[PDB]
């Protein structure tokens, strides 16, 4: 088949959905790889690099979308792209549909077959395609929160680690999964006093073992979260219900009780945000004020480190890409239950139950389009 990779178009999106190694492997398997000229430049992959691997370089985004049977992207199609969505094409990208009725409507109305990276889910419950991005986003959350804590950024004016005799920053991380663990680890590596909250006590046990209690753990209740957030210099919101809209855990009323100059980084903004006051921001204008605090709500965090994140992502996705290319969406999803959990839309049908409930749209069973005859 033809697999196509357009340039990413979201604000400051420097990533690309394939590397030369992946192109050479698709070409070796008999596939045709079409890449928009310049697509890899943000990640320092030249057109010449992609060409040497076996790709054909096309001039326009229109032609990539039109000719590709399998379309690989990094982020979700935005408004100026909805017109390129096709019936009978497979879209394989991050989608975050529970957070976007407009994105969902566009996919459904086009009749396309889309599979979301972030809902591909193995039997142990892990999300292997989201994982590398959560690792990047969590590590970044610690450094951006540290940066915005500087008084020159409107922040409280506290050094992450303090210095001998002087208190460090108090950091609260909500969520002890991939992003929360990575945020906690880097914040702790910067010398900050880190508390992590989760409702999953086994994830708290993992953190407790790994850092020998140096990273504090608290069972997450409204009662506990409220007290921890009031004491915080920096709050990192890192919760997830897979494929679903994030719960609002930090109320604006609570934020009104925070220290002036406190910073809140909502990593969960891609799924709607776990702070009441959260709304999507961009790398161009990443922050806004709520009461006396600073909110940071960038929904494509890993875009700023594309030399890291482009490879981290494709290291994980390529095995699924190869199966989709070789066998098509239906056979690949039948052969691989984890891939099938990524099924999002097909021929006008919403195949995600959580997204269906979250948006108030009718739900079609994934087992129906995968049923045998």
Ligand X SMILES: NC(=O)C1=CN([C@@H]2O[C@H](COP(=O)(O)OP(=O)(O)OC[C@H]3O[C@@H](n4cnc5c(N)ncnc54)[C@H](O)[C@@H]3O)[C@@H](O)[C@H]2O)C=CC1
Task: Say how far residue 355 (Cα) sits from the centre of its chain.
Answer: 16
**Taking CB within 5 to 8 Å according to partner kind, which of Mg ion, ligand X, a copy of itself, none is near residue 85?**
none
Please check if 24 is assigned to a binding site: no
Is residue 167 a contact point for a copy of itself (CB under 8 A)?
yes
Is 270 an annotated catalytic residue?
Answer: yes
Q: Which of 17, 97, 144, 350 binds a copy of itself (CB under 8 A)?
A: 144
Cβ atoms of 124 and 138 within 8 Å: the answer is no
The residue (of 58 and 74) whose beta carbon lies closer to ligand X is 74
Residues in region 239-258 near ligand X by CB under 6 A: 239-241, 246-247, 249
Separation of alpha carbons 303 and 2, rounded Å? 26
- Between the CA of residue 365 and those of 90, 304, 349, 362, 369, what are the distances in Å? 18, 37, 9, 10, 8
Separation of alpha carbons 226 and 254, rounded Å? 7
Separation of alpha carbons 366 and 214, rounded Å? 44
Cβ atoms of 262 and 293 within 8 Å: the answer is yes
Is residue 79 a contact point for ligand X (CB under 6 A)?
no
Is residue 257 a contact point for a copy of itself (CB under 8 A)?
no
Q: Could you tell me the two tokens for 237?
A: 């919101």
Please check if 239 is assigned to a binding site: yes
The residue (of 63 and 251) whose beta carbon lies closer to a copy of itself is 251
Phi, psi of 342, rounded to the nearest 5 degrees: -80, -15
Is residue 187 a contact point for ligand X (CB under 6 A)?
no
Q: How many residues bind to ligand X according to rule CB under 6 A?
A: 35
Question: How near is the Cβ of 51 to ligand X at its closest, in Å?
Answer: 25
Residues in region 255-314 near ligand X by CB under 6 A: 267-271, 298-302
Task: Enumerate binding residues for ligand X (CB under 6 A).
Answer: 118, 130, 133-134, 137, 174-180, 197-200, 203, 220, 238-241, 246-247, 249, 267-271, 298-302
């Amino acid at each position: 088949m033809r697999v196509g990779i357009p340039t990413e178009t979201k604000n400051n999106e420097f990533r690309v959905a394939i590397t030369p190694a992946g192109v050479a492997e698709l070409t070796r398997r008999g596939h045709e790889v079409l890449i928009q000229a310049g697509a890899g430049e943000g990640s320092a992959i030249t057109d010449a690099d992609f060409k040497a691997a076996g790709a054909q370089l096309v001039g326009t985004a229109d032609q990539v979308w039109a000719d590709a049977d399998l379309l690989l992207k990094v982020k979700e199609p935005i408004a100026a792209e909805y017109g390129r969505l096709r019936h009978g094409q497979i879209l394989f990208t991050f989608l975050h549909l529970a957070a976007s009725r407009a994105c969902t409507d566009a996919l459904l109305d086009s009749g396309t077959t889309s599979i979301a990276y972030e809902t591909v889910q193995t039997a142990d419950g892990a999300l292997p395609l989201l994982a590398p991005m959560s690792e990047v986003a969590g590590r970044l959350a610690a450094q951006v929160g540290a940066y915005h804590l500087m008084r020159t950024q409107g922040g409280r004016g506290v050094l992450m680690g303090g210095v001998p005799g002087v208190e460090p920053a108090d950091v609260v991380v909500i969520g002890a999964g991939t992003a929360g663990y990575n945020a906690a680890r880097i914040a702790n590596g910067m010398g900050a006093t880190v508390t992590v909250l989760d409702i999953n006590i086994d994830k708290l046990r993992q953190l407790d073992a790994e850092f020998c209690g140096r990273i504090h753990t608290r069972y997450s209740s409204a009662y506990e979260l409220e007290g921890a957030v009031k004491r915080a210099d920096l709050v990192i919101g890192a919760v997830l219900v897979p494929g679903a809209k994030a719960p609002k855990l930090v109320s604006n009323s609570l934020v009104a009780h925070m220290k002036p100059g406190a910073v809140l980084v909502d990593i969960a903004i891609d799924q709607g945000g776990c702070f009441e006051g959260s709304r999507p921001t961009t790398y161009d204008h990443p922050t806004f004020a709520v009461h006396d605090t600073l909110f940071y709500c960038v929904a494509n965090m890993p875009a700023s480190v594309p030399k890291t994140s482009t490879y981290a992502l494709t290291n994980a996705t390529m095995p699924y890409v190869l199966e989709l290319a070789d066998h098509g969406w239906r056979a690949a999803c039948r052969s691989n239950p984890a891939l099938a959990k990524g099924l999002s839309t097909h021929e006008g049908a919403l195949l995600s139950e959580r997204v269906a409930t979250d948006l108030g749209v009718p739900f079609t069973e994934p087992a129906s389009v995968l049923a045998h005859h």
